Design a protein around this nucleic acid. Structure first.
Ligand SMILES: [Mn+2]
Ligand SMILES: [Mn+2]
Ligand SMILES: [Mn+2]
Ligand SMILES: [Mn+2]
Ligand SMILES: [Mn+2]
Ligand SMILES: [Mn+2]
Ligand SMILES: [Mn+2]
Ligand SMILES: [Mn+2]
Length: 204
DNA sequence: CGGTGCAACAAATTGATAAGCAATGCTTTTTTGGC
DNA sequence: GGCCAAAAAAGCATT
DNA sequence: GCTTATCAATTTGTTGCACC
């Protein structure tokens, strides 16, 4: 129950024959590189699906039509993996874990009435060191938003005196930014094996 | 390529509970690039 | 596409 | 060990992207 960058590019390939494997492969790499770049430097504002397609077109001369069908598939394969209980691990970027959460005390932040947070399975993103370094080294860039899949943004970490967990020595840590992912609705419902039933849909 | 419409977004409230993390060396997994 | 040695990244420790 | 994130329900304003 673990899908790597390669095992994923393999599934996208076997489902995109009209597209050469080496291309189906370069694409995934370019996307993750565009994504990583966006978060660290960004520049071109928020990254979207149409930005990742245009880039593929520009960088790999790939037809826009196929570039779009891939980007979409790319995120669709990951979703498929996760909902199956599989964790997606992408080298040089980050891993997408699955965690089963037990019910805990909640409430209505507005009213204050105790309303418990049901047990569920949530998807989480763990930024690799490679990527984390870029974000702090670059000084942080823009964000990424892929509807139905999830969003990537940068969170600020104020400076603080930290400890070498081994020696106990203090170390001076500078403020920095770090990547943060928020699963999209479509991904939260498919991944959470506690809601694949009668959906929630009433008007009052 | 350019314009619309709308559900999926971000942000905002409290507060008990869960998850992550500062340095760094050894181990292990993954990828890389030639054949 | 598979084999392989090396390089890179992640993993673990504990994070 | 200390610090950051999770999440509840609901409103207000923004926006990605399917679809003309
Ligand atoms: Mn693994
Ligand atoms: Mn162009
Ligand atoms: Mn299944
Ligand atoms: Mn992991
Ligand atoms: Mn955030
Ligand atoms: Mn490393
Ligand atoms: Mn342990
Ligand atoms: Mn502890």
């Amino acid at each position: 129950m673990a899908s790597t960058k390669s095992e994923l590019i393999e599934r996208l390939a076997t489902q995109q024959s009209h597209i050469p494997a080496k291309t189906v492969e370069d694409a995934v790499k370019e996307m993750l590189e565009h994504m990583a770049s966006t978060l660290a430097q960004g520049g071109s504002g928020g990254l979207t699906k149409a930005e990742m397609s245009e880039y593929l077109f520009d960088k790999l001369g790939l037809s826009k039509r196929d570039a779009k069908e891939l980007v979409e598939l790319f995120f669709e394969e990951i979703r498929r993996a996760l909902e199956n209980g599989e964790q997606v691990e992408l080298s040089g970027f980050g891993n997408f874990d699955l965690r089963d959460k037990n019910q805990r005390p909640g409430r209505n932040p507005k009213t204050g009435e105790d309303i418990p947070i049901t047990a569920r399975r949530v998807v989480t993103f763990r930024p690799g060191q490679k990527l984390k370094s870029r974000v702090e080294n670059a000084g942080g860039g823009e964000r990424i938003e892929i509807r139905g899949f999830g969003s990537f943004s940068l969170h600020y970490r104020a400076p603080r005196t930290g400890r070498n967990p081994k020696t106990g020595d203090k170390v001076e840590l500078e403020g920095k930014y770090v990547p943060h992912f928020k699963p999209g609705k479509e991904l939260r419902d498919r991944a959470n094996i506690y809601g694949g039933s009668g959906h929630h849909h009433h008007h009052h």
